[PDB]
Amino acid sequence: NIQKRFYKGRVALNVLANNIENAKDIFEAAEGYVVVGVLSKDYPTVEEAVTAMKAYGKEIDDAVSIGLGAGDNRQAAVVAEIAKHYPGSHINQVFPSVGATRANLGEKDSWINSLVSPTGKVGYVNISTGPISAAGEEKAIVPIKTAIALVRDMGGNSLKYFPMKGLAHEEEYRAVAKACAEEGFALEPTGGIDKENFETIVRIALEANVEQVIPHVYSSIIDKETGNTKVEAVRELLAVVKKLVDQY
Amino acid sequence: TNIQKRFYKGRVALNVLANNIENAKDIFEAAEGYVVVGVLSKDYPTVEEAVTAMKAYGKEIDDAVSIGLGAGDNRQAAVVAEIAKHYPGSHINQVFPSVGATRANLGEKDSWINSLVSPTGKVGYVNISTGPISAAGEEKAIVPIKTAIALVRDMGGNSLKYFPMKGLAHEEEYRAVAKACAEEGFALEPTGGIDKENFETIVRIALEANVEQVIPHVYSSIIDKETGNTKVEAVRELLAVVKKLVDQYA
Amino acid sequence: AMTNIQKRFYKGRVALNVLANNIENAKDIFEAAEGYVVVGVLSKDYPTVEEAVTAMKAYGKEIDDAVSIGLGAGDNRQAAVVAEIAKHYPGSHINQVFPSVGATRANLGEKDSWINSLVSPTGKVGYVNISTGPISAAGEEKAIVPIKTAIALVRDMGGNSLKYFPMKGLAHEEEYRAVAKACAEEGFALEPTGGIDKENFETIVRIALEANVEQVIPHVYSSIIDKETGNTKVEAVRELLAVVKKLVDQYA
Amino acid sequence: TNIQKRFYKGRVALNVLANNIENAKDIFEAAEGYVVVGVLSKDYPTVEEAVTAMKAYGKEIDDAVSIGLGDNRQAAVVAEIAKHYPGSHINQVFPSVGATRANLGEKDSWINSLVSPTGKVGYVNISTGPISAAGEEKAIVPIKTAIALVRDMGGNSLKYFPMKGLAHEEEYRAVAKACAEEGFALEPTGGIDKENFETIVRIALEANVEQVIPHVYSSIIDKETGNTKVEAVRELLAVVKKLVDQYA
Ligand SMILES: [Ca+2]
Ligand SMILES: [Ca+2]
Ligand SMILES: [Ca+2]
Ligand SMILES: [Ca+2]
Ligand SMILES: [Cl-]
Ligand SMILES: [Cl-]
Ligand SMILES: [Cl-]
Ligand SMILES: [Cl-]
Ligand SMILES: [Cl-]
Ligand SMILES: [Cl-]
Numbered sequence: 001n002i003q004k005r006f007y008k009g010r011v012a013l014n015v016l017a018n019n020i021e022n023a024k025d026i027f028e029a030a031e032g033y034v035v036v037g038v039l040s041k042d043y044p045t046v047e048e049a050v051t052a053m054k055a056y057g058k059e060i061d062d063a064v065s066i067g068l069g070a071g072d073n074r075q076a077a078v079v080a081e082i083a084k085h086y087p088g089s090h091i092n093q094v095f096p097s098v099g100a101t102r103a104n105l106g107e108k109d110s111w112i113n114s115l116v117s118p119t120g121k122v123g124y125v126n127i128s129t130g131p132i133s134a135a136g137e138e139k140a141i142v143p144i145k146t147a148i149a150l151v152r153d154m155g156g157n158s159l160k161y162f163p164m165k166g167l168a169h170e171e172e173y174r175a176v177a178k179a180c181a182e183e184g185f186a187l188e189p190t191g192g193i194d195k196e197n198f199e200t201i202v203r204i205a206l207e208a209n210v211e212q213v214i215p216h217v218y219s220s221i222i223d224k225e226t227g228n229t230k231v232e233a234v235r236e237l238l239a240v241v242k243k244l245v246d247q248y
Numbered sequence: 249t250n251i252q253k254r255f256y257k258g259r260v261a262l263n264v265l266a267n268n269i270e271n272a273k274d275i276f277e278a279a280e281g282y283v284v285v286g287v288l289s290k291d292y293p294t295v296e297e298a299v300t301a302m303k304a305y306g307k308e309i310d311d312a313v314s315i316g317l318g319a320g321d322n323r324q325a326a327v328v329a330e331i332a333k334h335y336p337g338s339h340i341n342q343v344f345p346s347v348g349a350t351r352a353n354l355g356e357k358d359s360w361i362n363s364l365v366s367p368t369g370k371v372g373y374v375n376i377s378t379g380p381i382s383a384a385g386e387e388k389a390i391v392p393i394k395t396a397i398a399l400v401r402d403m404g405g406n407s408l409k410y411f412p413m414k415g416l417a418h419e420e421e422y423r424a425v426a427k428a429c430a431e432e433g434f435a436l437e438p439t440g441g442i443d444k445e446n447f448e449t450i451v452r453i454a455l456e457a458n459v460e461q462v463i464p465h466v467y468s469s470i471i472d473k474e475t476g477n478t479k480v481e482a483v484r485e486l487l488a489v490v491k492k493l494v495d496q497y498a
Numbered sequence: 499a500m501t502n503i504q505k506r507f508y509k510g511r512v513a514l515n516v517l518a519n520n521i522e523n524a525k526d527i528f529e530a531a532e533g534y535v536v537v538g539v540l541s542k543d544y545p546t547v548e549e550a551v552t553a554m555k556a557y558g559k560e561i562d563d564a565v566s567i568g569l570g571a572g573d574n575r576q577a578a579v580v581a582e583i584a585k586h587y588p589g590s591h592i593n594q595v596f597p598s599v600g601a602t603r604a605n606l607g608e609k610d611s612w613i614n615s616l617v618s619p620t621g622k623v624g625y626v627n628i629s630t631g632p633i634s635a636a637g638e639e640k641a642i643v644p645i646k647t648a649i650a651l652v653r654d655m656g657g658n659s660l661k662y663f664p665m666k667g668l669a670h671e672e673e674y675r676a677v678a679k680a681c682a683e684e685g686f687a688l689e690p691t692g693g694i695d696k697e698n699f700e701t702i703v704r705i706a707l708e709a710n711v712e713q714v715i716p717h718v719y720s721s722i723i724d725k726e727t728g729n730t731k732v733e734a735v736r737e738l739l740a741v742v743k744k745l746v747d748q749y750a
Numbered sequence: 751t752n753i754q755k756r757f758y759k760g761r762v763a764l765n766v767l768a769n770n771i772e773n774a775k776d777i778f779e780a781a782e783g784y785v786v787v788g789v790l791s792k793d794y795p796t797v798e799e800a801v802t803a804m805k806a807y808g809k810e811i812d813d814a815v816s817i818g819l820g821d822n823r824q825a826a827v828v829a830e831i832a833k834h835y836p837g838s839h840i841n842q843v844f845p846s847v848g849a850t851r852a853n854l855g856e857k858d859s860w861i862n863s864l865v866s867p868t869g870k871v872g873y874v875n876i877s878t879g880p881i882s883a884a885g886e887e888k889a890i891v892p893i894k895t896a897i898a899l900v901r902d903m904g905g906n907s908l909k910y911f912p913m914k915g916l917a918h919e920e921e922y923r924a925v926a927k928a929c930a931e932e933g934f935a936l937e938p939t940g941g942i943d944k945e946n947f948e949t950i951v952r953i954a955l956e957a958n959v960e961q962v963i964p965h966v967y968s969s970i971i972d973k974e975t976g977n978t979k980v981e982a983v984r985e986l987l988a989v990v991k992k993l994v995d996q997y998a
Binding site for chain 3: 877879885902
């Protein structure tokens with residue numbers, strides 16, 4: 001399960017894999033403190049996504065993160081369906097699909113995040129992150145702790161805070177980290193995270209006393225030519241995680 | 249059978265409770281079938297016993313069963329979600345955060361699921377924090393009505409159950425809910441404190457706003473406490489008000 | 499001889515305003531606050547002026563008449579009811595909508611009380627919305643006016659403070675500071691209301707005292723009410739009093 | 751004995767001052783009853799003396815007395831007089847309207863609300879009490895927002911003062927249009943004389959203000975006796991009939 005993937009129980013990386021070969025190199029470079037993203041959108045049917053994800057899982061101790069694909073809400077229903085057949089270790093989901101996904105897991109255990117977004121209003125998140133809700137003229141903009149309580153009632157384990165646009169919403173992010181710490185809830189900062197702002201983003205969460213943090217680092221560490229997530233980048237991220245977690 | 253068969257001229261269906269299966273049959277007759285009959289999960293100690301009972305009701309009333317929490321009791325949300333794996337009924341009462349689980353659990357079966365959202369004292373806004381953990385929070389998620397509608401659609405729900413209304417204590421709020429539902433093409437289920445003296449007003453507000461589909465819930469106000477039965481004459485009276493109003497506005 | 503409400507301000511600067519579930523809760527609150535509180539009793543909770551008057555007198559008998567007469571639920575239809583209650587019972591403090599202040603002061607007659615005036619944030623620093631009566635609040639446009647012009651009108655109508663609502667906690671912080679500074683310059687009192695909780699209370703009181711407002715009445719309602727018992731939490735009142743003392747003890 | 755009897759064809763009532771009871775009787779006759787006669791609170795040292803006087807005037811002219819300020823320092827005096835004598839018509843400053851209404855109790859009367867030209871078409875100055883008029887800035891508000899406030903305070907009309915004759919004509923016409931649209935009465939005052947009276951009343955009538963009370967003070971008063979000139983009242987009534995007969 002996912003609890004094995006947190007360095008000292010505090011931080012697990014989430015990065016994408018180009019293919020199974022890349023997944024294996026990533027898992028090794030992270031010393032196992034990682035869940036590896038496999039994207040539902042890369043496969044034409046639920047059936048094919050399941051078979052692929054089981055194949056990844058076999059090589060990396062089922063440390064698979066089931067992905068939408070950069071938070072793409074068109075894939076929410078697909079991910080909910082996949083959960084009937086494959087739990088992975090970690091599941092990315094939009095806010096309104098968390099309940100369906102948890103129900104679909106049935107007797108299987110997994111960890112499900114809930115995508116909520118910056119609003120420009122410190123203290124408040126946008127929970128309207130499914131297909132119909134994201135197409136609304138207005139969004140449901142709610143205090144962070146009220147979103148956490150709803151995610152709990154729906155069977156989720158964390159907030160996926162996306163799109164962060166790196167540090168563009170840093171003040172808002174600090175408030176989300178504080179609320180998560182106060183409620184004993186996990187946090188997954190995502191969007192525009194790179195080797196340069198990674199330390200800051202993870203430190204903010206640990207300094208706030210968020211117990212479990214899963215930073216997501218996607219295209220910024222992907223080699224454009226080969227498409228592979230770079231093993232040296234994964235090393236560098238892990239080095240940061242250790243430096244920070246050892247102190248906090 | 250699809251709940252759509254239960255709406256008079258496609259516009260209004262009653263939701264009332266039944267005390268036993270005979271009472272349910274009498275109600276279904278009195279309403280000319282334009283009703284779903286509430287059977288409460290909280291009246292059964294196991295999901296299995298609730299399922300067995302609900303199927304027995306459904307056999308006698310063309311499956312026009314409304315699966316109840318029990319006065320919106322949020323502790324029954326998980327029970328109702330589990331019942332949906334085994335019995336879809338025609339109509340399911342659920343709290344906002346449990347709609348998605350309930351829809352998923354229906355599996356290959358179809359049914360109609362409402363979503364409990366509450367008055368806030370703030371015209372234009374509803375409280376969606378109606379599950380066990382969310383309702384215990386110090387603050388609630390108070391959102392514009394249409395944003396709640398959109399979320400309910402993404403979770404697989406069919407309507408807003410607007411509760412507790414306290415009759416017309418929140419009339420201005422309720423008017424705004426009806427306007428939003430009409431604009432969004434979404435159904436509305438007014439509930440709480442509805443009786444023979446405010447039923448017409450409450451249904452009229454929704455129809456005048458051009459809400460397409462309305463399901464008013466009328467519970468204890470029409471129950472004879474001596475027998476425990478929902479009063480058949482009350483159901484006939486409510487049906488007559490429905491036909492008058494639907495004929496006027498449809 | 500001191501006015502009743504002057505007795506309710508800690509060192510003359512801050513009086514709490516909280517609701518009570520019943521008389522015993524009111525008594526408990528008044529003790530927890532060391533009397534530096536007025537307790538809200540809402541007119542909307544009574545179906546006649548006479549019943550409200552009886553009830554409010556009964557609260558007053560137990561808490562040195564430290565009753566704050568309320569509208570209830572923000573329902574501006576209660577403004578006329580509050581104005582009529584004032585003919586019979588002054589309490590210590592009266593909540594009123596801007597256009598109903600004058601009738602309320604007139605109806606007090608020979609009786610003494612402190613009357614606030616509801617004005618609202620506008621999204622425009624320096625300006626408040628005074629269109630808070632039944633007809634005016636339903637208008638196509640609102641009377642949006644500089645803060646001091648609202649203060650001077652409230653004074654001509656017989657009121658004592660601005661009730662600044664709805665604050666949404668610290669959402670209108672910049673607008674609120676401008677209201678506080680204008681109140682300070684005019685020697686007028688301020689009653690911040692809406693979304694105040696144990697976490698933002700200190701900042702809300704500090705913004706006002708730092709700007710040199712002399713008398714502040716923060717209203718703390720749902721955030722300190724136990725939803726299960728309906729009581730305003732006595733331990734929350736004790737905590738808020740401790741904050742008030744810590745601030746006020748260094749603000750002169 | 752209410753003010754509705756004082757409007758010629760239900761449209762226009764004069765308001766002019768009386769210097770003594772004989773002058774009041776003469777004015778009431780000259781206007782054929784289509785007048786409220788002003789008695790100034792400031793002409794008496796106490797409320798009680800004003801009340802005794804105003805009652806004596808009213809006895810002679812069918813209660814057709816307009817209670818006058820004469821001056822915002824008299825606002826509180828007028829509010830107090832209203833406890834004891836309603837007249838038919840009461841002049842009041844904007845912030846004292848609700849006190850005055852409340853003081854009337856069960857007695858009926860018509861209360862105006864003094865609001866002022868601003869130099870900004872569409873906007874009136876409602877800061878017309880003693881403290882408000884002494885402010886550095888004034889509350890300058892859209893006309894219809896003033897009307898709604900006056901209604902919430904229990905007033906019946908806007909007293910638009912000081913007009914300075916036609917110096918604020920564009921503004922006045924906009925006030926008339928707004929009053930007509932809202933079904934509210936209007937009382938033009940300040941510098942009205944025999945030369946601009948027709949123009950001022952025509953503006954209100956073409957705007958379709960239902961009830962208009964033009965106030966004509968010093969321009970028709972004999973300085974040597976203090977009396978309002980009875981022939982001037984007849985001249986004004988002739989203009990009122992000539993105009994109003996075209997609209998009613
Ligand atoms: Ca099958
Ligand atoms: Ca038709
Ligand atoms: Ca000072
Ligand atoms: Ca000092
Ligand atoms: Cl981003
Ligand atoms: Cl229910
Ligand atoms: Cl109810
Ligand atoms: Cl100052
Ligand atoms: Cl608020
Ligand atoms: Cl003039």
